[PDB]
Amino acid sequence: GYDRALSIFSPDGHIFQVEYALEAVKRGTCAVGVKGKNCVVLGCERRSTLKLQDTRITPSKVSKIDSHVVLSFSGLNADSRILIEKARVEAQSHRLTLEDPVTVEYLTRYVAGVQQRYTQSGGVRPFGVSTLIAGFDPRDDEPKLYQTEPSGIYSSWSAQTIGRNSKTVREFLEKNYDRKEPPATVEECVKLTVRSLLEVVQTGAKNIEITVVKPDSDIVALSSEEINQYVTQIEQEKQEQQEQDKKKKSNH
Amino acid sequence: RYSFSLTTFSPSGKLGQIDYALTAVKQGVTSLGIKATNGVVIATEKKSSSPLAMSETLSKVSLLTPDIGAVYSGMGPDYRVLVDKSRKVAHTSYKRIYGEYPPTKLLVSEVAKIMQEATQSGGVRPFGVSLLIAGHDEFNGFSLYQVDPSGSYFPWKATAIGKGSVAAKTFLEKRWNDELELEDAIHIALLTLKESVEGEFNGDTIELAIIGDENPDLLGYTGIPTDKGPRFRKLTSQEINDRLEAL
Amino acid sequence: RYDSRTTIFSPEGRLYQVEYALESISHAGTAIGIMASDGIVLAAERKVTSTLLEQDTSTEKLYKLNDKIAVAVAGLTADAEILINTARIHAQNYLKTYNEDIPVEILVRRLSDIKQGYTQHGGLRPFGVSFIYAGYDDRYGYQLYTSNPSGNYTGWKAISVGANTSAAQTLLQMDYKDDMKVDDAIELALKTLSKTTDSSALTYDRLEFATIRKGANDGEVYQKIFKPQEIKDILVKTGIT
Amino acid sequence: RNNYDGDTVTFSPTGRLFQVEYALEAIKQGSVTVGLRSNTHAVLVALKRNADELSSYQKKIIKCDEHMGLSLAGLAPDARVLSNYLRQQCNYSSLVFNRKLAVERAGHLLCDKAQKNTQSYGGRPYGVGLLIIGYDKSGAHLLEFQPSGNVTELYGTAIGARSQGAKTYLERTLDTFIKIDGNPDELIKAGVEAISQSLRDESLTVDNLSIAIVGKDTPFTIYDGEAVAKYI
Amino acid sequence: SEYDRGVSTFSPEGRLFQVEYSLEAIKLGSTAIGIATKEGVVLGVEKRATSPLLESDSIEKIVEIDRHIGCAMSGLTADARSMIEHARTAAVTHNLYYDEDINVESLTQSVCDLALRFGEGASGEERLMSRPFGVALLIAGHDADDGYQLFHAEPSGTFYRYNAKAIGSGSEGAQAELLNEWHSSLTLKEAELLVLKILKQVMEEKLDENNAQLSCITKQDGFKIYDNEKTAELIKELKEKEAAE
Amino acid sequence: SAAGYDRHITIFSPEGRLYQVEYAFKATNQTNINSLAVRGKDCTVVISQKKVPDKLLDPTTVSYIFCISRTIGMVVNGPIPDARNAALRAKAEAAEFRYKYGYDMPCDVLAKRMANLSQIYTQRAYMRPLGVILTFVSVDEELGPSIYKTDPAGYYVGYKATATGPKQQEITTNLENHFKKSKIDHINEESWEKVVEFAITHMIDALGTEFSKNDLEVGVATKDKFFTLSAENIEERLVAIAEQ
Amino acid sequence: SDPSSINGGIVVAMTGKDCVAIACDLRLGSQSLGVSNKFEKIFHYGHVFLGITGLATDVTTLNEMFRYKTNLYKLKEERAIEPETFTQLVSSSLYERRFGPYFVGPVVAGINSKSGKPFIAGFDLIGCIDEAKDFIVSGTASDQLFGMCESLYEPNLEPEDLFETISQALLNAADRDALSGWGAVVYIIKKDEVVKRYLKMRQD
Amino acid sequence: IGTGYDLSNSVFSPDGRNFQVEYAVKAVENGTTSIGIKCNDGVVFAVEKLITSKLLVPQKNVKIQVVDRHIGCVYSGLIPDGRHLVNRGREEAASFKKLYKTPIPIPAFADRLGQYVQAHTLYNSVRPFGVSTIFGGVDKNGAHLYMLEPSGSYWGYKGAATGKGRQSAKAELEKLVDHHPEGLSAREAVKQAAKIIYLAHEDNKEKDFELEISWCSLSETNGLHKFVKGDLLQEAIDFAQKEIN
């Protein structure tokens, strides 16, 4: 067998359908999340194939769950649609029940709950979709960034890479970014999300999408010009680097 | 593993069940329809498979509505359930929403929809038959149609199905004319069907009915001008004979 | 193998069943939607013909969804039947509720979700039909989308589904012009169907065609399915016949 | 063959089902118990087994009702279910019929409970053997419930691992313990002997013995720890 | 063997292979160790990260069940998300009906009853759980009719009372050590530092306050989740102790 | 062949028909009985062999002719389990009919409802098809003498006369020969008794066996009554043949 | 009283030689308080025109509902629904709730496309085709309108004269009722032109 | 026989058999001998109830069970599967009692049982029954005796057998008919029932059996069912012991 269903525990304590769901994620687009001290940047690789594709009418890879909680996603887009709709409906329901806006923790734990439920049954497979859920707490400033997996495990991570060739981005993110001292400014934060994505695109500022979430129900999605200005500043500091090695070699 | 459910597909597409379903159609007897500019003639044969078996207890030509008849080609038993359902839905879906007997295109779709549900489920075989449904309404005129095992339908000028399909198809192409009357169609129908068995032909072994003009005779009642008799008519055994003498 | 259920994934981390359904759409004919700022042309191919085939009194790769959205059909027609009927019902359910015609984007979204559900749940077959949607709603003007069998959607300025997709796409993007004209788009479509389809003559009775235009009044959109004899006049103009 | 053991809706050519015999084996894989009785008392004596010596045993006696109770042998998940239903029937009799439910009829509803999952696809024959003791109107009874659902009224029986040695102790001495009456201690003495022959590589402890007694004027009581150190 | 593909399904040894399989999932998990003493139960864990970006004190392996039952967990957090919520429900509904602090032993059975369900429906209890859970729990609390107790919940619906128990990767190395060093006479301070000694050894990472997290149930203090400043203080007290030895 | 599709009835073979349903036509010759029914002219007769395999059996329980309702008989060929089950529906259905539609239920309609039910069982893989061939007999409210054979597929056709069983071909050729040479579809003996004698003669000839009275069970539908004959009632007909 | 009598509104349709007229009031009332004077009551789905009298809530919901069924019809058949066929649709919708029916009284008006015959029909709470080819009335002043229309009516009227006949019929009847009037509107459906003409009139 | 057709009780072989249904009769063979003797004024049931060891409580184990109070059933084959069928028989009787206000006729009883068994050879998720039931009694239509096979098939019988000793049983039963064309009145048929089980046991001469005889007799129990118990039983034992030697 023993990979033929979820109702087979397997002779190794692994659920193969959870394992193969994970393998599914890799096929989708790269996504990176980085917290500041007064922001979260939620950034994603934006796929291209043709210049006959619209961007006018077509969904972004980022979807507003409410108004202070946001979501980016990686995996099959088809699968993810249903994930995103449920996450949203519940976030509005939360104010039907309590009269509060949603907490960040409440939401991620719920979206993993919905997959976990699916995983538990044998009739239905779980979705092959990993999300990063970014947001700020109801009345407070304290940036929050969270991860979900198809298994139905959720975690907090300061910064995170998911999607295509996650590991190779991850290592770079680790080195430059610190837990001890995260980016000063929203501006500096965004550029760090750009460095990470630059690698995975090859060439581009047009296959890089940037969005920002800040406290107090502030979500803004940054214009394409401003991304072009940033990819060019990263290439300008990078050129300074090449040379600085040449100078150091001449001196010594 | 590719061919052995309705739920499974192949690396060449489709389902095994539709290809096999098509095969079921061709095992049946030859049944044919020719559309004329004032009518449609529908014809089938009956193979008794014993002299003991009666020819009239087999009903291979069935009124769906009294404006729309059908025949089939394929497996005999499957036909019987589908006709009972076809009537049953004919009245439900569009005689309490429309309150009069359905237009030809509509019922074609409703009958087609049952076939579609019988493909849709995993664990439920598709029908053994493909029907021809010929009918009349005012709005789209006389018309003639094919409902294939898939759940899919096609309007036709003339077509044939069953075992005698390759000989009949090539005859129907050559011999159709731009304009033709019903009466002339009866003779073209008869000649085509005789290809399929020789020396066992005659108006008792051949079932023939039409959706032609109304017959206020067989309406059952009189003195109400707004309504019309049935467009459908079953030709008797003596009437088939008259038409056969004239060839 | 891992065709065996639809609710199981392959160790590769694809789903063979869906992939297989995607190959279902390459046993049916081409369908082309091109959006232009001056209209959308919807074009479809009839993959079956004969000389006794009645095809001149019928539309069957052009179905009107409401009064302002229409689709072209590529794939199984039995598959198509059930989802078109459902879509028509939901789009106009929106009309009742909100007293406005359905936005193009929401109705595609609704319908793509239902596709994902047939793979996600039960032991049902996924549906191997790719629909090119063309509508008009005030919030983004002319809107064009097309749907995959997987259950997802992407916007386009032109797209091709059906058979010989890879070739057809090549031909379109070579000859596209960003402003375009509604007339030049029709002409582009015919040029392309001609080459992918093996019916060299490419006659009227083998073509279905629909154009969506706002030219009827202003603020009011008129969806006009081209009728057979009309399809024959525009082949003379493009020179094909 | 044994390609037939994967469904409980499929029979063998030898006129068996394979799943039901396998469910029989499952009892043996677990702990050991010996039941025996007298006309005015009924006794189960059961061995408690622990996972390791920081582990503090597994409760092997489940009190059903104040006139009935049972011991388990085999898989515990299975036992908790069968017990629950049985208790439910004793409480139903007490409420609606003002009766202490007969041991024989109660055992018979269990046989019927077993067949419900045997017939139907999904579920399984239960993988635990139960010895039910009780005291009704017709005096003391000891029933041996099986996975199959075969229910057997006995003067003494034992199920579980290496239980054939208890039946040999009980068989020799059969007529002797029937004649004991009015003395619960002496039925316990006989039981303590019995469960000794069943053991291999072990010795009885004040926390291995769990002794369960119901009789005429004594309700069901489970002795544990420092109430089994008079008969250790 | 090959009899394990169904939702039951024997097996010539007479076991449910499916049920047994789920046991080895527990060794996947992060080590969890508990030590009962007559002054309280100290629940320690190992926390594993795959990168130092994973925010160590944001993940759950020790959880509050009510106000006097706590649990530590090892295995899948997926399977534990449903399991824990049941136990919470149970405890809150017990206080509703009877105004009584749920018993440690009964709370355990409650967990284990959900656990029993492996079918797609069957006589007796109705089953909706389509697979075993893949998480064991250590259940610790205090009732006043049987003091401090420690249970091990298994997803097999077997519950054993325990006096010290470890599970996960380092299960084997922990259990040997706990065999040579249990007492009834341990103070709560000896219990705490005993958890840390054993925990370093069966760890294969480095020990810090973010790869550890201790907690107690003592009735006075209620369930108390420790601070990282607090947890560090014990780690320091650990280093001092081996010097003497 | 074997794969999907002698293990399922929802799986079509490359022949076009389901093999297992066809196996039900090979599962109706497992009880080894032959029926011959013929039409009179205001009556219908049905006669089937009665097989007594051991003396330990009661010989009057051993029947296969059934009373379905006032004016309906039925003979079942094929296994007993499917016989009872088929017959139960048929009885039940006959009763159900009055209350919905008014008057008594004719043969044709009983046969159609049983035929659709048989198709249904083949439609779903949830049950097996029925293992029996049903031949319903009636004398009709206005359409008079009828024999209707409904096969487990669901194929149903009426008859002039019909035969069923493992030696079906042999009684069938004997009938063709009879009705073709007389030129009449019917049997033109206007009493019901002498049709029952003709039936007895024909079975005797085709099998090559003479039968006693514990070896035939005989049912007769007359117009607006139905009855099954007992062994001493069979004896009048048997002595009729034996001394002409 | 009846919820139908409370809210009010009148609808009256008429026949002529190849014409039908259908008119309404513009009044919306909730009890004696007049809410609106400029809400119409006649709608149309295709070239088949529908009126609805009665309780307001069911008059707007049944406008929405029949629109909803007719737009499905249109797409399916690839032709606009006929009056003859729409008269049956109207009875079917009403019969679907017997024991909690919609409080309305529909009036159907049109002229067939297949024969060009002029066509009109009347309805009721729980609905049935009530056939005439004279006139149909409904509403709170339905009893005034029933006699008032009959005196004025003559058959074989021209479309322009048919206007005079309906206008007169509705205005004076409306005036002498408390829960009708308050402005009007009339549609004269010729064949392929519909002229829509709003009656200037005394307020109530 | 061949491969396939076995696995599910709904699949046909080529031969026109279904191996699962066949497999159900085979299962009854291993079961313990049952006989029925019909009589002109009664029916007698006898059964061989094997005693595995001298530990069993004598006369306290039965396979003879009652339905309503006038119908006897005794089964051979698998004991608990057999119970289930008799349970259902009570349900059949009880339902008839409500509606019609009378005890079931025996042909009514046979019909409804025969359908329930047939249903459980009709589906894919059911299992075929593994029990035969010789059964019958006396009613307002005289005496009747039936024997129900595992297929869903039954017929009437003047003397019936099923179980391990069924070849010895049928052989004798046939003998009974020749010597007694009058079929034996009910009294002498008790004693005689005994002698058949004693003979049937020369193929079951392994372990001991307990002779349990019950009857339902028109002349001698007033058409009701009751066990034969006490001195009547003893007489039947003594006759059988004599004539076997």
UniProtKB/Swiss-Prot annotation, chain B:
Q: Which residues form a coiled coil?
A: none
Q: Subunit arrangement?
A: The 26S proteasome consists of a 20S proteasome core and two 19S regulatory subunits. The 20S proteasome core is composed of 28 subunits that are arranged in four stacked rings, resulting in a barrel-shaped structure. The two end rings are each formed by seven alpha subunits, and the two central rings are each formed by seven beta subunits. The catalytic chamber with the active sites is on the inside of the barrel.
Q: Which gene encodes it?
A: PRE8
Q: What is this protein called?
A: Proteasome subunit alpha type-2
Source domain of life: Eukaryota
Miscellaneous notes: Present with 7060 molecules/cell in log phase SD medium.
Family membership, please give it.
Answer: Belongs to the peptidase T1A family.
Q: Which InterPro entries match?
A: Ntn_hydrolases_N, Proteasome_alpha, Proteasome_alpha-type, Proteasome_asu_N, Proteasome_sua/b
Gene3D superfamilies for this protein = Glutamine Phosphoribosylpyrophosphate, subunit 1, domain 1 (3.60.20.10)
**Covalent link Glycyl lysine isopeptide (Lys-Gly) (interchain with G-Cter in ubiquitin), residues:** K105
**Regions that span the bilayer:** none
Q: Which UniProt keywords apply?
A: Cytoplasm, Isopeptide bond, Nucleus, Proteasome, Ubl conjugation
Cellular component, GO annotation:
nucleus; proteasome complex; proteasome core complex, alpha-subunit complex; proteasome storage granule
**UniProt organism field:** Saccharomyces cerevisiae (strain ATCC 204508 / S288c) (Baker's yeast)
Specify the taxonomic lineage: Eukaryota, Fungi, Dikarya, Ascomycota, Saccharomycotina
State any GO BP term from the record. Answer: proteasomal ubiquitin-independent protein catabolic process
Indicate where this protein resides in the cell.
Cytoplasm; Nucleus
Curated annotation (Swiss-Prot), chain E:
Subunit (UniProt): The 26S proteasome consists of a 20S proteasome core and two 19S regulatory subunits. The 20S proteasome core is composed of 28 subunits that are arranged in four stacked rings, resulting in a barrel-shaped structure. The two end rings are each formed by seven alpha subunits, and the two central rings are each formed by seven beta subunits. The catalytic chamber with the active sites is on the inside of the barrel.
Phosphoserine sites (modified residues): S51
Short name of one Pfam family: Proteasome
Reproduce the miscellaneous comment text. Answer: Present with 17100 molecules/cell in log phase SD medium.
InterPro entries hit by this protein: Ntn_hydrolases_N, Proteasome_alpha, Proteasome_alpha-type, Proteasome_alpha_type_5, Proteasome_asu_N, Proteasome_sua/b
Q: Any idea what this protein is called?
A: Proteasome subunit alpha type-5
A Gene Ontology biological process noted in the UniProt record is: proteasome-mediated ubiquitin-dependent protein catabolic process
Q: Which residues carry this modification: Phosphothreonine?
A: T50
Which Gene3D superfamilies is this protein grouped with? Glutamine Phosphoribosylpyrophosphate, subunit 1, domain 1 (3.60.20.10)
Q: Which SMART domains match?
A: Proteasome_A_N
Curated annotation (Swiss-Prot), chain F:
Keyword Phosphoprotein part of the UniProt annotation = yes
Pfam families noted in UniProt: Proteasome, Proteasome_A_N
Q: Name one GO biological process term.
A: proteasome-mediated ubiquitin-dependent protein catabolic process
The UniProt entry's GO CC annotations, sorted and at most eight, read:
mitochondrion; nucleus; proteasome complex; proteasome core complex, alpha-subunit complex
Quaternary structure annotation from Swiss-Prot or TrEMBL: The 26S proteasome consists of a 20S proteasome core and two 19S regulatory subunits. The 20S proteasome core is composed of 28 subunits that are arranged in four stacked rings, resulting in a barrel-shaped structure. The two end rings are each formed by seven alpha subunits, and the two central rings are each formed by seven beta subunits. The catalytic chamber with the active sites is on the inside of the barrel. Interacts with CIC1.
SMART domains given in the database record: Proteasome_A_N
Phosphoserine modifications at: S230
Q: What is this protein called?
A: Proteasome subunit alpha type-1
Could you tell me which CDD domains the record lists for this protein?
Answer: proteasome_alpha_type_6
| Domain of life per record | Eukaryota
The entry sums up its family as follows:
Belongs to the peptidase T1A family.
Further information in the entry reads: Present with 15200 molecules/cell in log phase SD medium.
- Crosslink site(s) for Glycyl lysine isopeptide (Lys-Gly) (interchain with G-Cter in ubiquitin)? K225
Gene from which this protein is expressed: SCL1
Q: Which InterPro entries match?
A: Ntn_hydrolases_N, Proteasome_alpha, Proteasome_alpha-type, Proteasome_asu_N, Proteasome_sua/b, Proteasome_subunit_alpha6
Keywords attached to this Swiss-Prot or TrEMBL record, sorted alphabetically, are: Acetylation, Cytoplasm, Isopeptide bond, Nucleus, Phosphoprotein, Proteasome, Ubl conjugation
Its primary localisation, in coarse terms, equals: cytoplasm
State which residue ranges cross the membrane: none
Q: Where in the cell is it found?
A: Cytoplasm; Nucleus
Curated annotation (Swiss-Prot), chain G:
Which keywords, in A-to-Z order, does the entry hold?
Answer: Cytoplasm, Isopeptide bond, Nucleus, Phosphoprotein, Proteasome, Ubl conjugation
Q: Which InterPro entries match?
A: Ntn_hydrolases_N, Proteasome_beta_3, Proteasome_bsu_CS, Proteasome_sua/b, Proteasome_suB-type
Glycyl lysine isopeptide (Lys-Gly) (interchain with G-Cter in ubiquitin): where is this cross-link? K69
Return the PROSITE patterns for the record.
Answer: PROTEASOME_BETA_1 (PS00854), PROTEASOME_BETA_2 (PS51476)
GO aspect biological process, one term: proteasome-mediated ubiquitin-dependent protein catabolic process
Q: Where located?
A: Cytoplasm; Nucleus
* UniProt keyword Protein transport, yes or no: no
Q: Could you give one GO CC term from the UniProt record?
A: cytosol
MF term (GO), any: endopeptidase activator activity
UniProt-listed Pfam families: Proteasome (PF00227)
Signal peptide extent: none
Q: Which residues carry this modification: Phosphoserine?
A: S30
Write out the similarity annotation: Belongs to the peptidase T1B family.
Please describe what this protein does. Answer: Non-catalytic component of the proteasome which degrades poly-ubiquitinated proteins in the cytoplasm and in the nucleus. It is essential for the regulated turnover of proteins and for the removal of misfolded proteins. The proteasome is a multicatalytic proteinase complex that is characterized by its ability to cleave peptides with Arg, Phe, Tyr, Leu, and Glu adjacent to the leaving group at neutral or slightly basic pH. It has an ATP-dependent proteolytic activity. This subunit may participate in the trypsin-like activity of the enzyme complex.
Q: What is this protein called?
A: Proteasome subunit beta type-3
